[PDB]
Write a protein that binds this ligand. Structure first.
Ligand SMILES: [Ca+2]
Ligand SMILES: [Ca+2]
Length: 317
């Protein structure tokens, strides 16, 4: 019932509508909490649909390890997705498809996020995982459209060729606790946004019970992003599972999409990543591995302990 998915490093592999590569590295962390999911053929009988997902876990790998196996099943169980499947298998005029498909994809991704999180949170309740959380950047490719969704601070970069050169941008903006409306939601729900000494630029979302649990000699946790999967004991204090969704038309000029964790972005800009990835391909090298190894080399050069780093490169055709 669920199409085959990939969750291990993937060297350069050619598919009908795109070529993909996936590489990850633990870096200098004591744990590997990054996870990912790639479904090459999302819709049986078709060869132009695929799912892409990368997950940056924190406070253990529980949330990222599990959510990765919940997204595809939840996605296709969506009544919204059933309508996507029915329309792709119908006579319905093309012009009409391309006109309705975007909102159907938007709604399906929305359903996926909320349903996958409800299921994950119930698991966290079962196994007593109070703060296990994970960011998410996902991409659903379907008949020339890519439905981008995300929660947290992992990002998706896009390389598009123009007559004046390669246009490189992020399709997602991080969910940070200090963004005015995020902060507003956290305080309305009894949580707070903490700006700690010497770290004014990276505030934390803190639960309303943090202080009490801290005095009880326990270990309440905080996050530096305001939306995510998991975070059981923060979901009632402002941590949202509402993803920002964006549907983009894959045009002839679209060259590459890069899904990666902050382990890559805290070091490289969108343009730098695309360039490195574009060059690697051009020279027959593993684009995703190039992104990770290049990042690790730079970190050493800076005397910086590297974070977990995961990169998934997708080249359109
Ligand atoms: Ca992490
Ligand atoms: Ca990270």
């Amino acid at each position: 019932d669920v199409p085959p998915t990939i969750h291990v490093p993937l060297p350069p592999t050619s598919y009908p509508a795109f070529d993909a590569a996936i590489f990850t590295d633990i870096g200098g962390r004591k744990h590997q909490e990054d996870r990912f999911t790639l479904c090459p053929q999302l819709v049986p009988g078709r060869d132009d649909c695929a799912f892409f997902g990368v997950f940056d876990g924190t406070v253990g790998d529980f949330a990222s390890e599990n959510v990765k196996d919940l997204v595809v099943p939840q996605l296709i169980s969506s009544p919204a997705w059933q309508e996507v499947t029915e329309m792709l298998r119908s006579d319905v005029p093309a012009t009409e498809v391309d006109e309705k498909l975007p909102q159907l994809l938007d709604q399906a991704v929305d359903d996926m996020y909320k349903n996958a999180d409800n299921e994950l949170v119930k698991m966290c309740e079962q196994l007593n995982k109070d703060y296990a959380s994970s960011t998410s950047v996902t991409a659903v490719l379907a008949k020339g459209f890519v439905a981008v969704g995300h929660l947290g601070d992992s990002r998706i970069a896009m390389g598009v060729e123009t007559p004046n050169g390669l246009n490189c941008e992020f399709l997602t903006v991080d969910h940070k606790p200090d963004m005015p409306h995020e902060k507003l939601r956290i305080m309305r729900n009894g949580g707070s946004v903490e700006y700690l000494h010497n770290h004014n630029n990276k505030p934390f979302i803190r639960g309303g019970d943090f202080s009490f649990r801290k005095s009880r000699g326990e270990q309440p946790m905080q996050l530096q992003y305001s939306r995510a999967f998991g975070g059981k004991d923060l979901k009632m204090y402002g941590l949202s599972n509402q993803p920002d969704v964006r549907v983009v038309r894959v045009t002839p000029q679209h060259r590459v999409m890069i899904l990666a964790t902050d382990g890559l972005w805290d070091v490289m800009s969108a343009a730098q990543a695309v360039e490195i990835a574009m060059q690697a391909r051009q020279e027959g090298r593993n684009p995703a591995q190039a992104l990770v190894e290049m990042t690790l080399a730079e970190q050493q050069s800076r005397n910086q302990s590297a974070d977990n780093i995961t990169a998934m490169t997708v080249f359109f055709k």
